[PDB]
Amino acid sequence: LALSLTADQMVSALLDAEPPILYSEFSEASMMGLLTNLADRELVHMINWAKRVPGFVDLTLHDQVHLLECAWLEILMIGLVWRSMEHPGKLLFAPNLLLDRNQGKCVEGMVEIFDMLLATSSRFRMMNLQGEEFVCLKSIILLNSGVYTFLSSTLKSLEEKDHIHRVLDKITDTLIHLMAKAGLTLQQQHQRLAQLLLILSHIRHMSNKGMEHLYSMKCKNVVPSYDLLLEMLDAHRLH
Amino acid sequence: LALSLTADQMVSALLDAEPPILYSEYDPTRPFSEASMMGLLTNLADRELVHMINWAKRVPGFVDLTLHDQVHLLECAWLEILMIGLVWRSMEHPGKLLFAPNLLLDRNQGKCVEGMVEIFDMLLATSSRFRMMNLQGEEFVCLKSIILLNSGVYTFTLKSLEEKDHIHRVLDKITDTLIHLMAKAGLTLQQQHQRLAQLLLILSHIRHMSNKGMEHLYSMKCKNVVPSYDLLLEMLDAHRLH
Ligand SMILES: O=C(O)c1ccc2c(c1)CCCC(c1ccc(Cl)cc1Cl)=C2c1ccc(O[C@H]2CCN(CCCF)C2)cc1
Ligand SMILES: O=C(O)c1ccc2c(c1)CCCC(c1ccc(Cl)cc1Cl)=C2c1ccc(O[C@H]2CCN(CCCF)C2)cc1
């Protein structure tokens, strides 16, 4: 069904899948508390969003967990950068939690992360990133980030990787369709596609940097565990 | 001059710029159990870095940037560049990493030191992906040039905007070059945009491996984990007219 979707149907499915914008609730302890709680509430909606990305639920639950374990922070960050796009010099964590780089000084390594996120928001603003492009990029992160670390090389894993690459190809077709509809020339379409996909390497960089600093802080729960993600993804049919 | 190059001239300039394949420095008459695997890899990386700076200077548009910006791009991309090179050399050696013609290692050989088997598995999966895609040498040189220009552009006055604009124009030329190569190979327009995306998404995995590699080098208390600004600036061999 996912591979049968047209570019317009892909765009519509992604726009419809969008999670809501949540609200929050400034010492090292206070701001971290608000950020941790916000990340945890957004994670719940991210799992529901992932289930609505065409082709995602066709995967095994172990592969769905793997993709989310790899991409959760990149997904939170691209969302954050998108919400912050029209707020130069600020990160819109929530409508009631708009922070600047100085507010990042409160926690270890947080300013470096804030500066990288603010530069990404600036880049989105410079490119005049559209909402329809944003939902395609966020879906790409979900399907791409973890596809290279399945490693089992089982016949099932080969079938899963082929499926992921076919869905990713449909998303590329969708991105090109959007650019063609916006009146870009073929040359401009290929150049913009590359510009958008290269920002994903910076998003990966920030996610790794963020995770490194989260571990340096040494808390009990750092990453959503396999079991926690499976618990949320491993739904029953009784509702 | 760089922005005036045709797609064919860009391809030729990149192929001509290619650094040499180096050999690992060890006594091949000795047991090698007596060779530090970390020592061999560190020495090889250090040797390759010198040739990487020479190569970077031959990437069209790179030397038009300020020296401070050239150093920043290399500080950001050096490990990703070593890794893409490694994955390319290993492409036709399933299950092995061709560090050098005399240093072909498997995943078990990564069990020697902390976090290396994880890095080896990720690199082997990338080689496998290149093999599946039948990556061409002309595409590889474009991707390696992209890593150099893209990796540090996000972590950079009107000169800075001009510097970023120049980098993005060179990156656009490389995208045009990759599309040209695919069009010449007989791919349809749809296949061209799909393959361009597939190649650029692998760069996110290359960034991931570079970050994981550096994290493990910092965990071991490795001397000079990263090339210093001064070392890179020295290797760039600045003109003497400033
Ligand atoms: O846009 C969002 O909703 C959003 C929310 C929180 C964050 C971010 C985006 C990314 C940038 C800032 C940031 C952070 C701040 C400081 C440092 Cl050094 C590192 C990072 Cl990445 C976090 C964070 C903060 C805490 C955090 O903790 C959670 C990680 C997963 N949770 C535990 C597992 C589930 F039980 C706790 C996750 C992200
Ligand atoms: O394809 C090459 O020539 C090539 C050479 C060495 C490496 C790689 C490719 C990448 C994979 C394996 C690897 C590594 C092995 C183990 C661990 Cl935990 C992490 C990594 Cl990334 C290194 C490495 C090893 C050491 C190393 O040392 C640095 C410390 C001193 N140097 C930088 C400062 C002077 F410039 C280099 C750099 C890369």
Write up what this structure looks like.
Two copies of one chain form a homodimer. The first copy, chain A, has eight helices and two strands. In chain A, a hairpin with a 2-residue loop joins strand 1 (91-94) and strand 2. Helices cover 66% and strands 3% of the residues of chain A. The first copy, chain A, has helices at residues 7-17, 28-51, 61-84, 110-127, 131-144, 155-181, 186-216, 226-233, and strands at 91-94, 97-99. In chain A, strands 1-2 form a two-stranded antiparallel ribbon. Chain A has a single domain (1-239), classed as Retinoid X Receptor (Orthogonal Bundle), CATH 1.10.565. With 239 residues, chain A is mainly α. The two termini of chain A are 24 Å apart. Chains A and B meet through helix 4, helix 6 and helix 7 of A and helix 4, helix 6 and helix 7 of B. The complex binds the ligand O=C(O)c1ccc2c(c1)CCCC(c1ccc(Cl)cc1Cl)=C2c1ccc(O[C@H]2CCN(CCCF)C2)cc1 (2 copies). The site of one copy of the ligand O=C(O)c1ccc2c(c1)CCCC(c1ccc(Cl)cc1Cl)=C2c1ccc(O[C@H]2CCN(CCCF)C2)cc1 has 23 residues of chain A, from helix 2, helix 3, helix 4 and helix 7. Chain A: Residues 6-239 are annotated as: Transactivation AF-2. Chain A: 17beta-estradiol binds at residues 42, 83, 213. Chain A: A lipid is attached at residue 136 (S-palmitoyl cysteine).
Which properties best describe this structure?
about 65% helix; dimeric; Estrogen receptor; binds ligand L5B; receptor; homodimer; mainly alpha; Retinoid X Receptor; transcription; about 240 residues
